[PDB]
């Protein structure tokens, strides 16, 4: 009928929007940006690999129900896979001091399963998280993945289970053999 359901993915989670096919996608982009506490200028929305302009409507773009829009936060994106199998991507490259093994770094983070279900966030507690980098106090993917970040940076870590909670998983919310996705913002080193 008159309306269309669109999925918007940012590489970490996915949420749906229902809008009129004749409504300009600006409102969707605004609702997505305001939800993630981000400025509209800082986001790029892509459909069929082509960047969406806010004046364009789903009808203009011949969108179908349950089509996917990608929201990107970075400058060409680069996903690095290290020798351990850890994957990381700098969404924002910081410009302050560099985090190295042995330093106590303070961060905000959100963690999701690879299906998009959030399992924890320091932002939910309104409380930054600090740890000794390389100190064996966090999962291996974090001791490796946070090194090299600079203050002000946001880095997305994709952690295979052997660098996370392994075959066992953790508690009630981390399943066995789970790959973990974290977005980590370095606040202080
Ligand atoms: O959990 C804490 N310390 C244990 C070590 O944690 C970790 O190595 C990873 C990576 C570093 C940040 C947190 N986590 S996590 O994957 O989000 C843990 C988790 C799993 C399932 C549900 C909720 C939370 C902890 C202590 C003090 C304040 N805040 C968190
Ligand atoms: Ca704290």
TrEMBL record:
The keyword Lyase does not apply. Ca(2+) 1 binds at residues 127-128. Mg(2+) binds at residues 127-128. Signal peptide: none annotated. Its EC number is 5.2.1.8. Keywords: Calcium, Isomerase, Metal-binding, Rotamase. It is an enzyme of class 5 (isomerase). Ca(2+) 2 binds at residues 127-128, 188-189. GO terms for molecular function: metal ion binding; peptidyl-prolyl cis-trans isomerase activity. The keyword Isomerase applies. It comes from the Bacteria. It catalyses: [protein]-peptidylproline (omega=180) = [protein]-peptidylproline (omega=0). Gene3D superfamilies: 3.10.50.40. Residues 102-189 form the PPIase FKBP-type domain. Belongs to the FKBP-type PPIase family. PPIases accelerate the folding of proteins. This is Peptidyl-prolyl cis-trans isomerase. It comes from Burkholderia pseudomallei (strain 1710b). The lineage of its organism: Bacteria, Pseudomonadati, Pseudomonadota, Betaproteobacteria, Burkholderiales.
């Amino acid at each position: 009928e008159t309306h269309i359901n669109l999925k918007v993915s940012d590489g970490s989670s996915e949420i749906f929007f229902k809008i009129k096919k004749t409504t300009p996608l600006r409102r969707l982009m605004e609702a997505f940006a305001k939800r993630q506490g981000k400025e509209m200028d800082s986001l790029r929305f892509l459909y069929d690999g082509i960047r969406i302009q806010a004046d364009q409507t789903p009808e203009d773009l011949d969108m179908e129900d349950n089509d996917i829009i990608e929201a990107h936060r970075e400058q060409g994106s680069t996903v690095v896979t290290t020798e351990s199998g850890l994957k990381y991507e700098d969404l924002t490259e910081g410009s302050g001091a560099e985090a190295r093994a042995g330093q106590t770094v303070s961060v905000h983070y959100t963690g999701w399963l690879t299906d998009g279900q959030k399992f924890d966030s320091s932002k939910d507690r309104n409380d930054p998280f600090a740890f000794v980098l390389g100190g064996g106090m966090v999962i291996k993917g974090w001791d490796e993945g946070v090194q090299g970040m600079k203050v002000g940076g946001v880095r997305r870590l994709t952690i295979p289970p052997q660098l996370g909670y392994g075959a066992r998983g953790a508690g009630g919310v981390i399943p066995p053999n789970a790959t973990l996705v974290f977005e980590v913002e370095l606040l202080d080193v």
